[PDB]
């Protein structure tokens, strides 16, 4: 039974405060550290920030921590809830909040408790967390599926100087036969990319962004993709490694058109592209490079351009800003056949139960699910166990650099070793890992 | 009693393989992850690397992992050693190796076992790791001392483009009253530095090095220090934050002289400085900026320049490359009165026992001890508990960015909270934390 619930302020990978929750039961203390989320959020669960410009530049979580300690904990303790009953945990928390976006107690306060409980239930049942999450999500467990990691290697858009408007370039070692081999190949590609980067752009270019990728000053999409192809080739893994893109197109959508030179800042509007023109540019890249996944190719509310594109895409299309892990939004996305993969961000919805339902609804529509990290990550490895528990076959948790990223990748190494013959690597079937 | 010893390959914060050890006792499985070290090392313990250019670019640790599993484990299990007897653990490992630099089994293989055992002994004794390390080192425990963190904020030298030859610039919030306050102020300085950096040098300048600091293209030492002073001022903590420098001068020592434009690469030798001229340049900086610590001001074998400088320094002088955590070297450093602080890198010597003896010898000579991270760090928080156990009052474990760095800083937050009135923050007495 839960005897104590406590929260404290700790730091995320960007050096901003975040909430750490510890839940005590008869079996020990279980901890969860929440990643940073959004405090202003239409369609998303809102994390609570202090707003006191005199402390942490207005990003403290003292209120949130207060909500956990002074409000949730006494209630939670008295409710006597069975932690093995995740939905009972979550319904309890939501009910305590009473808002649609968890803006009363804060999504960061609620999520912290929701995840710690799941750790505590696994402890109780005596199984690894991933097996517990498999149970709660009703996933097949014969065998378990290890994911292809979509590794961030290079960043453009708002994350870099240069003209490049596309935000993220990832490599996915779909050709490996095991998770350990996929990670080894993926790191070799990364290191070669870093050497090529420093060689062509300067020692400066070799420094990393928040998720571990480089951000040289690149002018075009072909420039970025050529660099990546060279790195793949240099490591000797041509054919075994595919590319994934995150266009984050909402960043350059203006006046109903897409500004590919949005950093311009005298960007010629005669050159802005309509949805259809932009689709032609993607088709182009898709023909020359081994791209197998494109995230957010169109803006968050440009439904017609997604639908249009989806018709002829032929590769996985991932919804991130389109859906913001919001069930009403997902439902519409499915209905409009706007894409076929959901980027899942647990702190965007706020509870583990609601995260699992969103994945289940996706799977039921034939969609794939890509479990994702956040910009501000922590040393907590939760999403590693969650991608295995959900059997999605694909995770986006950063480059093979920066331990808030490697902590998850190292955790997948351990899980893979622990399962022995009871695990298969998703490989080329990443899109539909749930059905392997 | 130890029933099993196992090792596996996992990744460090740079994406290179490292060794993870798990030790099983009647109380559970205890893990340790070793940071990356040197495989070629005169005066230092050598970590073992595979050297197979076809895998991980020649940086695998499969041999090392083999050494643990096939060689150390069976021996260790059969020896029946009391893990509470750290020296018995370590002597056993060393004896198994039989070399002065652990080049037979590999320092990475030995260290992994040495640290896991200490975790297992704490478990057994039923105390937090830091209390166990306090016991083993015979440190005062009334009260415990929390360290001033020397946070990396900006890098030059080999770590950056630009002319700046000095390698590391750190801030140390000596003016805070608690570890939590020191970390909060230190992060505020860091964030302001990042904004100023991006504003003056470009979005590019805002990307981070291996330890979390920025590396804009800076030309001079005054340029770097002015930027830092502006950041301190901008955050409103003038007076509460001091500067620490790591000159890593061995990198620019050539022909008996110091090349401050070593990146030149037409560096005018008419401009190279002798030890004495270089001392004058430091005295200069020391008069204009709030510098309270200087690491490696002179080259690894330039004994006369350290001695000379030390005479008039008046601030803490830290030996890193001079000593390479090597007891014979330390002894000479003490004897020559070359410095008054030892940079302690546990994997540089290879065992926890030998790490504690090196600190004890330092303290006995009146020296301070700065516990340090490595370039290639992991999610393991070991050095957090070790700096508290040793009562040094000072740690260098990176910027408040990148979780391999924040994992330690978050761990110090937890320790501080756990100790309540039994802890004091070293503050301005960091140099001699052991004697508070
Ligand atoms: Zn996205
Ligand atoms: Zn140094």
What gap in Å lies between CA A274 and CA A279, rounded to an integer? Answer: 9
Q: Exposed, middle or buried, A421 (CB in 10 Å: 0-12/13-18/19+)?
A: exposed
Determine, for residues A10 and B410 on separate chains, whether the beta-carbon distance falls below 8 Å: yes
User: Do A59 and A17 meet the contact criterion of CB atoms below 8 Å apart?
Assistant: yes
What gap in Å lies between CA B395 and CA B387, rounded to an integer? Answer: 7
What gap in Å lies between CA A431 and CA A287, rounded to an integer? Answer: 20
- Residues B134 and B213 both lie in one domain: yes
Determine, for residues B406 and A57 on separate chains, whether the beta-carbon distance falls below 8 Å: no
Q: b/e string for A160-179 if b means 16 or more Cβ within 10 A?
A: bbbbbbbbbbbbbbbbbebb
**Cα B171 to the center of its chain, rounded Å:** 15
The two tokens of residue A436 are 């392997």
The two tokens of residue A26 are 């008869």
Query: Which domain-ending residue is among A77, A99, A126?
Result: A126
DSSP B383: H
What gap in Å lies between CA B376 and CA A402, rounded to an integer? Answer: 9
What gap in Å lies between CA A277 and CA B323, rounded to an integer? Answer: 63
B138 in active site: no
- Ligand 2 midpoint to CA B360 (Å): 20
Residue A346 CA: distances (Å) to CA of A137, A158, A352, A378: 14, 24, 7, 14
Query: Which domain-ending residue is among B126, B157, B189?
Result: B126
Task: Give the closest of B10, B180, B208 to A413, CB-based.
Answer: B10
Residues 6+ apart with CB under 8 A from B99: none
Q: How far off is chain A from B180, nearest CA to CA, in Å?
A: 9
User: Do B426 and B182 meet the contact criterion of CB atoms below 8 Å apart?
Assistant: no
The two tokens of residue B107 are 């320092």
Determine, for residues B55 and A184 on separate chains, whether the beta-carbon distance falls below 8 Å: yes
- Residues A53 and A145 both lie in one domain: no
Report the alpha-carbon angle A356-A358-A362, nearest 5: 115
DSSP B336: T
In the three-class reduction of DSSP (H, G, I as helix; E, B as strand; rest coil), residue B341 is classed as strand
The two tokens of residue B258 are 């110091």
- Residues A316 and A186 both lie in one domain: yes
Q: How far off is chain A from B268, nearest CA to CA, in Å?
A: 23
- Name every chain B residue with its beta carbon within 8 A of the beta carbon of A409: 11
DSSP A47: P
- Residues A184 and A37 both lie in one domain: no
Token pair 């590999």 is found at B106
- HSE-CB at B253 with a 13 A cutoff on CA atoms is 18
Strands B168-172 and B242-246: antiparallel
User: Do A291 and A194 meet the contact criterion of CB atoms below 8 Å apart?
Assistant: no
The two tokens of residue A340 are 């076929």
**Cα A368 to the center of its chain, rounded Å:** 14
User: Do A168 and A155 meet the contact criterion of CB atoms below 8 Å apart?
Assistant: yes
What gap in Å lies between CA A78 and CA A152, rounded to an integer? Answer: 44
Could you please report the per-residue DSSP string of B231-285?
HHHHTT-TTT-EEEEE--GGGGEETTEE-TTTT-SS--GGG-B-HHHHHHHHHHH
A3 is in an annotated binding site: no
Partners of residue B29 on adjacent β-strands: B24
Token pair 């005479």 is found at B311
Q: How far off is chain A from B295, nearest CA to CA, in Å?
A: 24
DSSP B46: P
- Ligand 2 midpoint to CA A292 (Å): 44
A396 is in an annotated binding site: yes
Partners of residue B24 on adjacent β-strands: B4, B29
Helix axis angle, A352-364 relative to A129-137, nearest 10°? 60
Q: Exposed, middle or buried, B13 (CB in 10 Å: 0-12/13-18/19+)?
A: buried
Element spanning B368, H or E: strand B368-372
End-to-end CA distance of chain A: 37
Kindly report the CATH number assigned to the domain that includes residue A357.
Answer: 3.20.20.120
Q: How far off is chain B from A192, nearest CA to CA, in Å?
A: 9
Q: Give the residue among A77, A80, A81 at the shortest CA–CA distance from A68.
A: A77
What gap in Å lies between CA B399 and CA B411, rounded to an integer? Answer: 15
DSSP B23: E
Which one of the listed residues B47, B211, B300, B416 is annotated catalytic?
A: B211
What gap in Å lies between CA B344 and CA B320, rounded to an integer? Answer: 8
What gap in Å lies between CA A49 and CA A36, rounded to an integer? Answer: 10
- Name every chain B residue with its beta carbon within 8 A of the beta carbon of A413: 8-10
DSSP A70: I
B222 in active site: no
Determine, for residues B379 and A161 on separate chains, whether the beta-carbon distance falls below 8 Å: no
Determine, for residues B15 and A399 on separate chains, whether the beta-carbon distance falls below 8 Å: yes
The two tokens of residue B104 are 């037979």
User: Do A176 and A427 meet the contact criterion of CB atoms below 8 Å apart?
Assistant: yes
- Ligand 1 midpoint to CA A291 (Å): 16
Query: Which domain-ending residue is among B126, B161, B190?
Result: B126
**Cα A337 to the center of its chain, rounded Å:** 22
DSSP B371: E
Determine, for residues B410 and A379 on separate chains, whether the beta-carbon distance falls below 8 Å: yes
Q: Give the residue among B192, B100, B12, B398 at the shortest CA–CA distance from A401.
A: B12
**Backbone torsions φ then ψ of B162, nearest 5 degrees:** 95, 175
DSSP B214: B
- Residues A351 and A210 both lie in one domain: yes
The two tokens of residue B256 are 């008996």
- Name every chain A residue with its beta carbon within 8 A of the beta carbon of B409: 11
What gap in Å lies between CA B29 and CA A416, rounded to an integer? Answer: 18
- Residues B111 and B257 both lie in one domain: no
- Residues A257 and A113 both lie in one domain: no
Task: Give the closest of A11, A204, A407 to B217, CB-based.
Answer: A204
Which domain range does residue A31 map to?
A: 1-126
Determine, for residues A410 and B20 on separate chains, whether the beta-carbon distance falls below 8 Å: yes
- Ligand 2 midpoint to CA B213 (Å): 14
Other Cβ atoms closer than 10 A to B283: 13
Residues 6+ apart with CB under 8 A from B404: A402, A403, A406, B12, B13, B373, B377, B378, B379, B398
End-to-end CA distance of chain B: 37
Longest Cα separation, chain A:
67
Helix axis angle, B352-364 relative to B107-125, nearest 10°? 80
What gap in Å lies between CA A320 and CA A308, rounded to an integer? Answer: 18
Helix and strand tally (H, E) in chain A? Answer: 14, 16
- Name every chain A residue with its beta carbon within 8 A of the beta carbon of B15: 187, 190-191, 212, 399-401, 406
- Residues A318 and A263 both lie in one domain: yes
Report the alpha-carbon angle B19-B23-B28, nearest 5: 135
Q: b/e string for B170-209 if b means 16 or more Cβ within 10 A?
A: bbbbbbbebbbebbbbbbbbbbbbbebbbeebbbbbbbbb
Residue B48 CA: distances (Å) to CA of A151, B94, B97, B111, B355: 28, 15, 12, 12, 19
What gap in Å lies between CA A120 and CA A115, rounded to an integer? Answer: 9
User: Do A284 and A332 meet the contact criterion of CB atoms below 8 Å apart?
Assistant: no
- Residues A286 and A309 both lie in one domain: yes
* Method used experimentally: X-ray
| Total domain count, chain A | 2
- Residues B276 and B357 both lie in one domain: yes
In the three-class reduction of DSSP (H, G, I as helix; E, B as strand; rest coil), residue B227 is classed as helix
DSSP A45: P
- Ligand 2 midpoint to CA B320 (Å): 5
User: Do B37 and B373 meet the contact criterion of CB atoms below 8 Å apart?
Assistant: no
What gap in Å lies between CA B55 and CA B65, rounded to an integer? Answer: 15
The two tokens of residue B120 are 């297992």
Q: Give the residue among A363, A332, A358 at the shortest CA–CA distance from A345.
A: A358
- Residues B155 and B98 both lie in one domain: no
Element spanning A188, H or E: helix A179-201
Token pair 């039961």 is found at A25
Q: Which ligand is nearest to the CA of B343?
A: 2
Kindly report the CATH number assigned to the domain that includes residue A114.
Answer: 3.30.390.10
Q: Give the residue among A16, A20, A55, A9 at the shortest CA–CA distance from A39.
A: A16
What gap in Å lies between CA A340 and CA A316, rounded to an integer? Answer: 6
- Name every chain A residue with its beta carbon within 8 A of the beta carbon of B217: 204
What gap in Å lies between CA B46 and CA B44, rounded to an integer? Answer: 6
CA-based R_g, chain B, Å: 21
| HEC string for A73-114 | HHHHHHHCCCCCCHHHHHHHHHHHHCCCCCCCCCHHHHHHHH
- Ligand 1 midpoint to CA B246 (Å): 39
- Residues B69 and B213 both lie in one domain: no
Tell me what percent of chain B is helix, strand and coil, each rounded to the nearest 5. Answer: 45, 15, 35
Sign of CA dihedral A431, A432, A433, A436: negative
């Amino acid at each position: 039974a839960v005897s104590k619930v406590y929260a404290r302020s700790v730091y995320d990978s960007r050096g901003n405060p975040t909430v750490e929750v510890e839940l005590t039961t008869e079996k020990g203390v279980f901890r969860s550290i929440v990643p940073s989320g959004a405090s202003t959020g239409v369609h998303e669960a809102l994390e609570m920030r202090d707003g006191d410009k005199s402390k942490w530049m207005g990003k403290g979580v003292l209120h949130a921590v207060k909500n956990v300690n002074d409000v949730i904990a006494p209630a939670f303790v008295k409710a006597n809830i069975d932690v093995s009953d995740q939905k009972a945990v979550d319904d309890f928390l939501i009910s305590l909040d009473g808002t649609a976006n968890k803006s009363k107690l804060g999504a960061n306060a609620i999520l912290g408790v929701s995840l710690a409980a799941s750790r505590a239930a696994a402890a109780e049942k005596n199984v690894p967390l991933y097996k517990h999450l498999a149970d709660l999500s009703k996933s097949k467990t014969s065998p378990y599926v290890l994911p292809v990691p979509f590794l961030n290697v290079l960043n453009g858009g708002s994350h870099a100087g240069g003209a490049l408007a596309l935000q993220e370039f990832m490599i996915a070692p779909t050709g490996a036969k095991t998770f350990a081999e996929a990670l080894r190949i993926g790191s070799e590609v990364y290191h070669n990319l870093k050497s090529l980067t420093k060689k062509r752009y300067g020692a400066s270019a070799g420094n990393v962004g928040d998720e571990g990728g480089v951000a040289p000053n690149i002018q075009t999409a072909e420039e970025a993709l050529d660099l990546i192809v060279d790195a793949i080739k240099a490591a000797g893994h041509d054919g075994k490694v595919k590319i994934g893109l995150d266009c984050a197109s909402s960043e350059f959508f203006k006046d109903g058109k897409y500004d590919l030179d949005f950093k311009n800042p005298n960007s010629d509007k005669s050159k802005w592209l309509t949805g259809p023109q932009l689709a032609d540019l993607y088709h182009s890249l898709m023909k020359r490079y081994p791209i197998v996944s494109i995230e957010d190719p169109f803006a968050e509310d440009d439904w017609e351009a997604w639908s249009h594109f989806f018709k002829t895409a032929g590769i996985q299309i991932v919804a991130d800003d389109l859906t913001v892990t919001n069930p009403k939004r997902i439902a519409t996305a499915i209905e409009k056949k706007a894409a076929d993969a959901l980027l899942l961000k647990v702190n965007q919805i706020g509870t583990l139960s609601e995260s699992i339902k969103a994945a289940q609804d996706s799977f039921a529509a034939g969609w794939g699910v890509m479990v994702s990290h956040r910009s501000g990550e922590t040393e907590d490895t939760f999403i590693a166990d969650l991608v295995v528990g959900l059997r999605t076959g694909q995770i986006k948790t950063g480059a093979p650099a920066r331990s808030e990223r490697l902590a998850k990748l190292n955790q997948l190494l351990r899980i893979e070793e622990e399962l022995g013959d009871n695990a298969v690597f998703a490989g080329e079937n990443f899109h539909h890992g749930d059905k392997l």
